Amino acid sequence: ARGPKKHLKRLAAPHHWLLDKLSGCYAPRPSAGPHKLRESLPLIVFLRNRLKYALNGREVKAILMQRHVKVDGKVRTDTTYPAGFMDVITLDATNENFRLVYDVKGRFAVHRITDEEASYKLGKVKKVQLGKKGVPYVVTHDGRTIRYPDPNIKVNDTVKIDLASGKITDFIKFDAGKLVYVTGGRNLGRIGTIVHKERHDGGFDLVHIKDSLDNTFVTRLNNVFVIGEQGKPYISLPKGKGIKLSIAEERDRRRAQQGL
Amino acid sequence: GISRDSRHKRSATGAKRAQFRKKRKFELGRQPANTKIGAKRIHSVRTRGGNKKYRALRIETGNFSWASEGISKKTRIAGVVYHPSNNELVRTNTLTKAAIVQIDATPFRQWFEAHYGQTLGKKSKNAERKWAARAASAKIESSVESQFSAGRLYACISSRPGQSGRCDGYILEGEELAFYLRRLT
Amino acid sequence: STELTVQSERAFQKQPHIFNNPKVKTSKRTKRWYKNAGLGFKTPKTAIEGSYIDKKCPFTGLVSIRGKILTGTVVSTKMHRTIVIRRAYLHYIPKYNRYEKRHKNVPVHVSPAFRVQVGDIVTVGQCRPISKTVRFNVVKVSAAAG
Amino acid sequence: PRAPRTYSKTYSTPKRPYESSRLDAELKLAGEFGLKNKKEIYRISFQLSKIRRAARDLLTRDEKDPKRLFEGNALIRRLVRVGVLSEDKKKLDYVLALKVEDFLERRLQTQVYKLGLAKSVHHA
Amino acid sequence: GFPMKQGVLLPTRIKLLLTKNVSCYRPRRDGERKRKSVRGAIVGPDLAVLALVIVKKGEQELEGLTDTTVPKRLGPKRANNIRKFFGLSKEDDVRDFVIRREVTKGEKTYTKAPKIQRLVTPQRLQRKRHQRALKVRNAQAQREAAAEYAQLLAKRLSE
RNA sequence: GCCCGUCGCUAGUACCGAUUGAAUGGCUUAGUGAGGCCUCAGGAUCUGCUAGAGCGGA
RNA sequence: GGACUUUUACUUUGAAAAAAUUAGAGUGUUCAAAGCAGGCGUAUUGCUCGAAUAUAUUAGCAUGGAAUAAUAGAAUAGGACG
RNA sequence: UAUCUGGUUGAUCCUGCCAGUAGUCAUAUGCUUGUCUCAAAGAUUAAGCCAUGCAUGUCUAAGUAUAAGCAAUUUAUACAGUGAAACUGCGAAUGGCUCAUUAAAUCAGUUAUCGUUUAUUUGAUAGUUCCUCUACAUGGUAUAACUGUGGUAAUUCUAGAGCUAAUACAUGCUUAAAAUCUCGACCCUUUGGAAGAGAUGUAUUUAUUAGAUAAAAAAUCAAUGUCUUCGGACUCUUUGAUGAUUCAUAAUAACUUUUCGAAUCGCAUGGCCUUGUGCUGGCGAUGGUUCAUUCAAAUUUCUGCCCUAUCAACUUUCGAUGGUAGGAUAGUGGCCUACCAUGGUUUCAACGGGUAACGGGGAAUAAGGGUUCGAUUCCGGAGAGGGAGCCUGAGAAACGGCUACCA
Ligand SMILES: NC[C@H]1O[C@H](O[C@H]2[C@H](O[C@@H]3O[C@H](CO)[C@@H](O)[C@H](N)[C@H]3O)[C@@H](O)[C@H](N)C[C@@H]2N)[C@H](N)[C@@H](O)[C@@H]1O
Ligand SMILES: [Mg+2]
Ligand SMILES: [Mg+2]
Ligand SMILES: [Mg+2]
Ligand SMILES: [Mg+2]
Ligand SMILES: [Mg+2]
Ligand SMILES: [Mg+2]
Ligand SMILES: [Mg+2]
Ligand SMILES: [Mg+2]
Ligand SMILES: [Mg+2]
């Protein structure tokens, strides 16, 4: 194919972007960046498609060229920039602070968080490894590399990152009864406790989960993100707390509150 | 050019395969530098992704480690003596990995007769202090020591002059020096 | 499967960077390096007490076992340090709601420290390409009925 | 390379083209309800075929099946909202007895005549 | 109209594969080579024009040549080239020495001059200061967290 | 009553067939062999360092 | 307390599973094919539900089951437990 | 949405096909044609041939302006607005098009990299630099555009003469302290000491060493470091990740036509006191080595393709299967070479032949089971008249790049 594909055909876009069928041949094609492209949310989907602040793509750049948007505390100028899970997106004039966090339907949800707690984020350590000169380091899902971490931080643990200095502050181990966010698969968006991690040598350890409603479900270890201690989330959850109402139960709540 | 692909080969069942596509650079092969013994001549090769490589077509003077003694010296590489793959490489004195070449002794004799105070197989206190302590470590193989008489040591090239541009080896010791001394004879 | 006297080859057989100092007298004339395979595969005794080299050996060699782990009966021992497994299976033809007997012949590399013959159901695991047909390496052996 | 615009046909033709008893009944439905051509009859015979099919597929599923309940009700809830299914015929066994005039009755065609406003279906 | 190529010998035209940094070809894109006819280096009657350059001058004056002298179009630009031109010192501050040229609007003579490059300026010396400080500052802070971890390691060995 | 086959007429289809009959496409033997690439050379003309003589570099 | 399939086939549950399309929930594009829109309210600086769900298993991976159907084992004991 | 009906007899019941019947994202054609919404469209035949035009170019406050450019008016006597040309950088390897090739190939689902390359993005990361006086308040040439002299019927042809720039090209300064290693002048003889000389950034190549630990305790040979109720006491002896490694990482000795370690730019003009063009100093840009990440790539496991036996044996000259070694590659590997074996596939259909064959998502038909189709909107593959070659570059075996043969 001779080199990097620079185009994303619409309809080959990720569905959790929720891009309409018509209106163009193409989708934004997230830039290379902190998140993997099928798992990220290009700034243009956020501003125009989500927040409705911009209409054209031409407007989206006008906004961004003004430096009206930061991500994880820095000005990001890239139209297609790949913001993703646990990113911040501070729009200063308008005084809004968000965090990118999943729907119970799998979709990056608009979630407004306080002016603080924008001051930090949760990375889930991907590998921990001994760098050269003798310095160990930890790498997160978002691609952050932080030297000199706690020796008790292990792969699959999560981490609290300051975002002003970088600088990990405390952390959570990965083990039973921890509060967990499901970052992919059928159950993407559900939140819950642990119970059991069924290990398999050679690959694909399963993590069984139990949410607040005493519902049980499994995904792979990779799909599990550690967000805190039971009933004690370290970041603001969005409405409904990753609960997964049944389709019938969804119909009841709709026609409950609509009408009377 | 040279293609390294597997598709040009017959299949396991022995059927002949039809050509699927045109040769691609990423399967490219290159022509062997047959490195020889002479004035240093080394050409770079710009390989996949930036990435220079170094073809050594003419070399003398390379780095050989004396494993038991724990030191390395830089010597002349007099010639090639054996080679397992192709005896023509011995004929043509071609430097490749697994060479089995002769090298200059004198940087090794110069380091022994300094370090250990002794000679090979015929004052200043602080110097005599170390010479006495390091003894009882001063006995090496008779099969090695006897070489120093001739001025040339049997060694084997450990690097790939065609890739690194360095002709580098270790002086033959141990059981391995017995094997090659037997083939040599 | 068969092996020579150790050094039969025009080149010196030894393991890489496994060095025994002639300045230091020893009991065992040659240092030997082994490794645990993993996956609960027990590196057998012949592996550690042999003199054999076989850099393609899962233990004592530089290959590593990762990927699929297959089992199959050993139909040809005739090659040197490799053999041929016949894996049997039954394929489903949905129209006829029934199965058909198929099979596949897999070349695999049989380390010394295994003495294998036809019969001899064998466990084997994916090693990376060895030669052109060989992706699998003998790991565990079970006995023959006849 | 623009996303394809999907579409579907709304009607179906009868298997035997020449049937006196069926060609009469279609004429009748044409005259009572002021219809244009057999195609309009046909479009409705189609809707009915699709709804009876989904019902059939639901009624072979065990009752209290989440799918049977969820899709069963919603089918019935739409059929009532238009006035095709009676204030209670509301079980699925009844939609299977539903027929074409029940749909044909709900045409803005037929409602403009049904209450005043017209004094004909053709005036309607 | 085909040019000569230096040192190809021959009194004829040949067809050669030409590269960048070779006379008679200007590559139209990067890595492009082209096969072009080129005329030998050896003089023959088939040359339309033979270009020669005067080495040692003869007795009488050549009318359009030895007589009229024609100016260089531009004067020095880089700092030390100005210095090398006039024979100045390292301490001599080129600046006021540089050549200017007068241009009239219709009514206004104005002058213009180059922008000296490789000039030693307050800005440049500041940039050196900032980087040096950045180096040593970071190298100390890199020791700081480093000894700080070494303690936290001995503190987790107690834990 | 049915009904078979040679013979004879007309039309159509394939078949055997001298012609070492012809055409197109794939794979080829052998001889020859363009071109770039690698490599041994060559050194038009330019340059460095130590009137001179000398040692390199492109 | 954590780990036996002798070796299978078979069967259950699950994970991992692109959108489009197919089935289907919601939604008056004036109906409709469609589309993923929209719905309230003072319309003065607003509020808000959505964008479900179901679905190849051939093969692989994880798993609960042991009927059926294969299969291995002590006989010149060179058998098992200690 | 599980349906038939007409045609063999004088009649009869069958067999059985022909005929009717219904759909077709299924193409053509004929006759007919008013409205709204929607919209396939030179695939089939000829991956047959093509006039002409167009489809790839690109500049910020921030690499290079002496335009004999334009406007200015600066505060302007180094430069300072705007700004052609040209350099330098980047892109042109994306798209779009087509279905010729292709039948274990492609492709799908599923693995593999402990088997590799990766411009870029995002996050990290650099006090060590021929010191056998030497610019570091900053080394050196060289060119374009341009000026002028020219050749050709002709082209995005260019010769020869003169100028002048850089984040082009080519060079090259450096900054704390310690510790540890060799050599060793001398102290003088003892459990015996040491002044001082060098070496030590990073990367490259090789050898060697550590990276431990499944339960314990002693003996000696050699070497060797730290306490000393000065005799010997000896220390509870500091060590990551993986199912698994010769892994991450570190040490020793060296090696190198020595990789990198800012001679770069834009905005700001703040602060010290000895007031010197002194010293210091802010927010950005562009670079730079390594690592990680991201966008990828290359191989790769398992199972799965249509008709054919009027294809039964196939594969190994000339690599066929495997072993060793080397070479090569980014890297695995018969990818290739040398040597050595004789293997490898096959009625559970090998091998060959055919395909009006790119694979898949999917499409038509609607009891069910099935039958037929899928050039073509998405994904993957292939090609750019046929073949092969290769240049640039992170990436091409590119074709709106080159070289050559054929047409
Ligand atoms: N040049 C190609 C096009 O030409 C016409 O456009 C029509 C146009 O369609 C446009 O294209 C889009 C895609 O088809 C529509 O979705 C838009 N609403 C509209 O702006 C219609 O809205 C007009 N009423 C008629 C006009 N001739 C055809 N009828 C289209 O079918 C066709 O694709
Ligand atoms: Mg949208
Ligand atoms: Mg594991
Ligand atoms: Mg010789
Ligand atoms: Mg071990
Ligand atoms: Mg639909
Ligand atoms: Mg400058
Ligand atoms: Mg006739
Ligand atoms: Mg003839
Ligand atoms: Mg619906």
Ligand SMILES: [Mg+2]
């Ligand atoms: Mg609708």
Ligand SMILES: [Mg+2]
């Ligand atoms: Mg199965």
Ligand SMILES: [Mg+2]
């Ligand atoms: Mg039975």
Ligand SMILES: [Mg+2]
């Ligand atoms: Mg009859």
Ligand SMILES: [Mg+2]
């Ligand atoms: Mg009749």
Ligand SMILES: [Mg+2]
């Ligand atoms: Mg009759």
Ligand SMILES: [Mg+2]
């Ligand atoms: Mg009759």
Ligand SMILES: [Mg+2]
């Ligand atoms: Mg029919």
Ligand SMILES: [Mg+2]
């Ligand atoms: Mg109108």
Ligand SMILES: [Mg+2]
């Ligand atoms: Mg309309």
Ligand SMILES: [Mg+2]
């Ligand atoms: Mg036409």
Ligand SMILES: [Mg+2]
């Ligand atoms: Mg065509």
Ligand SMILES: [Mg+2]
């Ligand atoms: Mg393309």
Ligand SMILES: [Mg+2]
């Ligand atoms: Mg075939």
Ligand SMILES: [Mg+2]
């Ligand atoms: Mg795939």
Ligand SMILES: [Mg+2]
């Ligand atoms: Mg150095």
